[PDB]
Coordinates of C-alpha atoms and ligand atoms in Angstrom, one line a residue:
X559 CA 121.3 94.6 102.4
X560 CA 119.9 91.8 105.2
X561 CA 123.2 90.5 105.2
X562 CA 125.2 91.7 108.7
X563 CA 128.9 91.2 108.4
X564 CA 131.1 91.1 111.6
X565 CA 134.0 92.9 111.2
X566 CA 137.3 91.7 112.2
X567 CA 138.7 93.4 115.2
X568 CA 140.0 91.6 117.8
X569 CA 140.3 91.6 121.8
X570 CA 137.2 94.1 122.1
X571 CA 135.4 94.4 125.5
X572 CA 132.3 96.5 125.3
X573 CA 133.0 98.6 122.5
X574 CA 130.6 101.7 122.7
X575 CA 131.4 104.7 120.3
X576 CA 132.1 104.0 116.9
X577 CA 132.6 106.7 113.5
X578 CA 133.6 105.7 110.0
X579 CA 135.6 108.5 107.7
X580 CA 135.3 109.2 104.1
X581 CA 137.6 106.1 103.4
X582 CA 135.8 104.0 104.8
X583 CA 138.1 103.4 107.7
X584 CA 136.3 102.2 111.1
X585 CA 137.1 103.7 114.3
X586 CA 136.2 102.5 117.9
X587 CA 136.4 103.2 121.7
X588 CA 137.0 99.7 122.8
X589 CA 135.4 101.1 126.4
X590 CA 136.9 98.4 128.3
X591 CA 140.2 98.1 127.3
X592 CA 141.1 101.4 127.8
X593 CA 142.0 102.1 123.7
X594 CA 140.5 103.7 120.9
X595 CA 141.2 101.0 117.5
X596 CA 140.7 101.4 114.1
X597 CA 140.1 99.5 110.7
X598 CA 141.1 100.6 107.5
X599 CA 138.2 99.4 104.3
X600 CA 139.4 95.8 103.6
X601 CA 141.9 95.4 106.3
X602 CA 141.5 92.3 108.5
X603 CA 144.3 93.8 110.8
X604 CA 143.3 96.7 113.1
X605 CA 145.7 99.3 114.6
X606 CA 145.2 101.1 118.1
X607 CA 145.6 104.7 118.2
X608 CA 148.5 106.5 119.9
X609 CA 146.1 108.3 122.8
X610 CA 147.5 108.2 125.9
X611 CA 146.4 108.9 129.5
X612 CA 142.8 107.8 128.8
X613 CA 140.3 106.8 131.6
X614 CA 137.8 104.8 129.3
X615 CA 137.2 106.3 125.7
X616 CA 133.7 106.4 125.4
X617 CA 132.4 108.0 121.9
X618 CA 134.5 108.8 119.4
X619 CA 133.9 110.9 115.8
X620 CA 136.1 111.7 112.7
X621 CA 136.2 115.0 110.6
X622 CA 137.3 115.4 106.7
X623 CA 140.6 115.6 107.5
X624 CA 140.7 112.6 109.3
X625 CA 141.4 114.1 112.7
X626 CA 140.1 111.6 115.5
X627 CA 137.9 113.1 118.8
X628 CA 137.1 111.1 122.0
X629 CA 135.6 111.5 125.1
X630 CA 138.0 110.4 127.6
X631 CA 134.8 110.2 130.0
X632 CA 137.1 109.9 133.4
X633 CA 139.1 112.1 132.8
X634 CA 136.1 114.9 132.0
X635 CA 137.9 115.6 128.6
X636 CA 137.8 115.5 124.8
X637 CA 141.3 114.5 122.7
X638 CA 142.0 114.7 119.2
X639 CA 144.7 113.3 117.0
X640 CA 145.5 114.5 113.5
X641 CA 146.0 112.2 110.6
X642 CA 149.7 110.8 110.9
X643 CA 150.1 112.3 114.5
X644 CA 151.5 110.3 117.6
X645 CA 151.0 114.0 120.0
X646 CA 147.3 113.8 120.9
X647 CA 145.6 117.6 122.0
X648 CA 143.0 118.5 124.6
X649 CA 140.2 120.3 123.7
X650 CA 139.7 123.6 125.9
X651 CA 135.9 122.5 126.6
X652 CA 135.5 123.5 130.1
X653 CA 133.8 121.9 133.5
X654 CA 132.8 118.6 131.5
X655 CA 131.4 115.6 133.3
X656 CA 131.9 112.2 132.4
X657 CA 131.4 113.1 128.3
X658 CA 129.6 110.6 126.2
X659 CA 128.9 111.3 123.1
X660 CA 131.2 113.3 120.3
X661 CA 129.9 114.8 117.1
X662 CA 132.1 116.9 114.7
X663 CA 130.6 119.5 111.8
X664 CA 131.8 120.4 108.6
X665 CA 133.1 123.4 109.9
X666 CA 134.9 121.2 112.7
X667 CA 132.3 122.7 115.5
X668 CA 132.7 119.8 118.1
X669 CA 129.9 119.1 120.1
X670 CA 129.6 116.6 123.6
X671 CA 126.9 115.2 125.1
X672 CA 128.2 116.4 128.9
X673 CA 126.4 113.3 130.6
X674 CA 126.9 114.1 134.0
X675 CA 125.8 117.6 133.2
X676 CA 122.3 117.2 131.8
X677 CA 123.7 119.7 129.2
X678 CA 124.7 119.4 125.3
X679 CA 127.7 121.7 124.7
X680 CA 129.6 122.9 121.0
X681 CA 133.0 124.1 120.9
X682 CA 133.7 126.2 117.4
X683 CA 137.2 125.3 115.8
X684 CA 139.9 127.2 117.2
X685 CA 137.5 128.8 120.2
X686 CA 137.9 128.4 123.9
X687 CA 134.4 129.3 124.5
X688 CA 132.3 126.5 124.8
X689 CA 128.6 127.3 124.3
X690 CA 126.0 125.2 126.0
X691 CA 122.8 124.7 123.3
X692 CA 119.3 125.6 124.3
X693 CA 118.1 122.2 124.6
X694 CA 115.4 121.6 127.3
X695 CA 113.9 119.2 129.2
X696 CA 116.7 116.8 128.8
X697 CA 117.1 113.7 131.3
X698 CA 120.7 113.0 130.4
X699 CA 121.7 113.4 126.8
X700 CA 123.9 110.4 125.8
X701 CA 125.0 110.8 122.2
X702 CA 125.0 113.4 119.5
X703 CA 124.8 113.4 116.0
X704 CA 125.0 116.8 113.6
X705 CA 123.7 117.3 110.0
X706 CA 125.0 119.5 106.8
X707 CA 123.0 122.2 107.6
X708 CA 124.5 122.2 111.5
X709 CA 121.4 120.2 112.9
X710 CA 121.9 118.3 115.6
X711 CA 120.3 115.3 116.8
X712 CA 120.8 114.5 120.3
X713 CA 119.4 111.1 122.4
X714 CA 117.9 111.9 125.4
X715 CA 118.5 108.8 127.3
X716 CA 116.1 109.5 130.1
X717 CA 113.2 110.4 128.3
X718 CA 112.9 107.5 125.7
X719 CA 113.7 110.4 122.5
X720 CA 115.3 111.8 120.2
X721 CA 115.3 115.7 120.0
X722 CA 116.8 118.0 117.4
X723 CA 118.0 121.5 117.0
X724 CA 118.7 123.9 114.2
X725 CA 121.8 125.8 113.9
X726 CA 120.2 129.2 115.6
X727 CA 117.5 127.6 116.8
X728 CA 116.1 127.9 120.4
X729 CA 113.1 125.6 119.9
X730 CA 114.0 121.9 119.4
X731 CA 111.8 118.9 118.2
X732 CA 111.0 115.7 119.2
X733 CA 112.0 112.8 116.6
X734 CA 108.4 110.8 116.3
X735 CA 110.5 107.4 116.9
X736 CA 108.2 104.5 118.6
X737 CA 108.7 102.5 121.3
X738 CA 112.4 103.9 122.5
X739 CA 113.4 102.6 125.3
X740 CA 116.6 104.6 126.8
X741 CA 118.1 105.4 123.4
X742 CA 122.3 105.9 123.6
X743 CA 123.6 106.8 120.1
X744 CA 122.5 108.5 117.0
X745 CA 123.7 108.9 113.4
X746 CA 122.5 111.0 110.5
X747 CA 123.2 110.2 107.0
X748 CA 123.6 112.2 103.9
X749 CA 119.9 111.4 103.2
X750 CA 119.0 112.8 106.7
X751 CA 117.6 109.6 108.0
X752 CA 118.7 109.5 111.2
X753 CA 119.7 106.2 112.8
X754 CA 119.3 104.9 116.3
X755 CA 120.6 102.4 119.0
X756 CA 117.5 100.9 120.9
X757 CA 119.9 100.0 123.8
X758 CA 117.2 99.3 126.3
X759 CA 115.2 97.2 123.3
X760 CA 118.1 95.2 121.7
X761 CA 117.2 96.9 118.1
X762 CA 118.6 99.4 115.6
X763 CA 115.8 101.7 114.1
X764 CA 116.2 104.8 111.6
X765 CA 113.9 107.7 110.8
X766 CA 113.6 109.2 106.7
X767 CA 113.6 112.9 107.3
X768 CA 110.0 114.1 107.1
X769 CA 108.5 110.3 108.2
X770 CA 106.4 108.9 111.3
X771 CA 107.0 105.7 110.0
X772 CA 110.6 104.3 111.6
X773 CA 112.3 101.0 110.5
X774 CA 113.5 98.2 112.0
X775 CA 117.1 97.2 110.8
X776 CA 117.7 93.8 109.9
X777 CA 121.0 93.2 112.3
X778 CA 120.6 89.4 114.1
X779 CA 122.1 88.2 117.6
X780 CA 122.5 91.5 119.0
X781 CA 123.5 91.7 123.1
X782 CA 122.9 95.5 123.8
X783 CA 123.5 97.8 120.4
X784 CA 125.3 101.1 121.9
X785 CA 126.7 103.1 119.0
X786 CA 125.9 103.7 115.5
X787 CA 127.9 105.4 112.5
X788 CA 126.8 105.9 108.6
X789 CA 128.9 106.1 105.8
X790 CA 128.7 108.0 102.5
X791 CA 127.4 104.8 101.1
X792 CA 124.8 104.1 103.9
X793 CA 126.3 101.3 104.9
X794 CA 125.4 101.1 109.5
X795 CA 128.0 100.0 111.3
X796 CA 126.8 99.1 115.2
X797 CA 128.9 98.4 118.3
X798 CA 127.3 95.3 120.1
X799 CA 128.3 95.8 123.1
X800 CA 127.0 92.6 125.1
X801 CA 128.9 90.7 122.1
X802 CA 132.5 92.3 121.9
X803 CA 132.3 93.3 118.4
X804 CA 131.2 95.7 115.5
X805 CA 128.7 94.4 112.7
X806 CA 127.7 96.3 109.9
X807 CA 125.3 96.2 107.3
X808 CA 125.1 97.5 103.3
X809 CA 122.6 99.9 102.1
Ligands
CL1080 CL1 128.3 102.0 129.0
CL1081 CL1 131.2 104.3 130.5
CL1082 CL1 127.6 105.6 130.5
CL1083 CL1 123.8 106.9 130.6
CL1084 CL1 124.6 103.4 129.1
CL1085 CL1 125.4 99.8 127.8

C-alpha cells in the first residue's frame, strides 16, 4: 500500500472534488473544464456526466443509490443526477455562496460548505429548509465530510483545522491534526479515520479516531492535493490539482 497508481482519465484541468460509490466507480469535478467525469472500477475510458448549465463544478459526493451532487459554485447551487438520469435537479438550498464542498448521509441529508458564507449548511431529503449547523469560529469552511453516526467533519480553511460536530450537537471539536496549513478536503472512512488534503503543505495526512498521532500518506510528485475520497476498501483516491490528474492508493 506505498504503491500510488494514476488513474486514467483524460483532458483534466485542476480537478478539485472527487467521491468514489460502493462500486467502486470514481467521480470528479474536472474544475476547469467546466464538467463533472467519471470512472467505472477497471475502466480505462471515462464518461462525462450529463449536467448542464454549470459555472465550474467544484465538490462533488455520491449516495447509496448512486445519485451524483455538485456544487455548481458560480452559479450558488447544488445539482443532483440519479443513476441512469440525463434531467439533472436543483437542490432547494437557499442564499448559497460560491459552495465548495458536498457531503451526503445515509439518510441522504446533504450538507455544503457555503464558502462565501462562512457558514456549513444541511438540507434533509425531501426538505426545503436548509438548516445552518452551530459551528463557530470558522474562517471559511472549504469541504465537508459526514460519518455513520451523522458526524460531520468540516475543514476550516482559514484556521489551519479540522472541526467536528455531532448529530445534535452544539459544541464541536477541534481534530488534533499537526502542522495544517489551509486544509481543503476531508474524508472519513468506515474505520472513522478521517483523511485530509494539506493543500497549503503538498501532503495527504489521516487521523484514527481517538489518536493525536496523524500519518503521513505515502503519495509522490504531488503539485497541490485538493480533494480526497475513501472507499469501502480504504483505498484514498486524491485530486492533484497542480498535476491534472487523480492518483490513488490501496489500503
Ligand atoms: Cl480552487
Ligand atoms: Cl473554484
Ligand atoms: Cl475556491
Ligand atoms: Cl478557499
Ligand atoms: Cl482553494
Ligand atoms: Cl487550489
Amino acid at each position: 500500500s506505498n504503491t500510488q497508481t494514476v488513474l486514467p482519465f483524460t483532458g483534466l484541468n485542476t480537478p478539485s472534488g472527487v467521491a468514489v460509490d460502493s462500486a467502486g466507480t470514481v467521480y470528479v469535478t474536472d474544475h476547469g473544464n467546466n464538467r463533472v467525469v467519471k470512472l467505472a472500477a477497471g475502466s480505462n475510458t471515462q464518461t462525462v456526466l450529463p449536467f448542464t448549465g454549470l459555472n465550474t463544478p467544484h465538490g462533488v459526493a455520491v449516495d447509496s443509490a448512486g445519485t451524483v451532487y455538485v456544487t455548481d459554485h458560480g452559479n450558488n447551487r447544488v445539482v443532483k443526477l440519479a443513476a441512469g438520469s440525463n434531467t439533472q435537479t436543483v437542490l432547494p438550498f437557499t442564499g448559497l455562496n460560491t459552495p465548495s464542498g458536498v457531503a451526503v448521509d445515509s439518510a441522504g441529508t446533504v450538507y455544503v460548505t457555503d464558502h462565501g458564507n462562512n457558514r456549513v449548511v444541511k438540507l434533509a431529503a425531501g426538505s426545503n429548509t436548509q438548516t445552518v449547523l452551530p459551528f463557530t469560529g470558522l474562517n471559511t469552511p472549504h469541504g465537508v465530510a459526514v460519518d455513520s453516526a451523522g458526524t460531520v467533519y468540516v475543514t476550516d480553511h482559514g484556521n489551519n483545522r479540522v472541526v467536528k460536530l455531532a448529530a445534535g450537537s452544539n459544541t464541536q471539536t477541534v481534530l488534533p491534526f499537526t502542522g495544517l496549513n489551509t486544509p481543503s478536503g476531508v474524508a472519513v472512512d468506515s474505520a472513522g479515520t478521517v483523511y485530509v488534503t494539506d493543500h497549503g503543505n503538498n501532503r495527504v495526512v489521516k487521523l484514527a479516531a481517538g489518536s493525536n498521532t496523524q500519518t503521513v500518506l505515502p503519495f509522490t510528485g504531488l503539485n497541490t492535493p485538493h480533494g480526497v475520497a475513501v472507499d469501502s476498501a480504504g483505498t484514498v483516491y486524491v485530486t492533484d490539482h497542480g498535476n491534472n490528474r487523480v492518483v490513488k492508493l490501496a489500503a
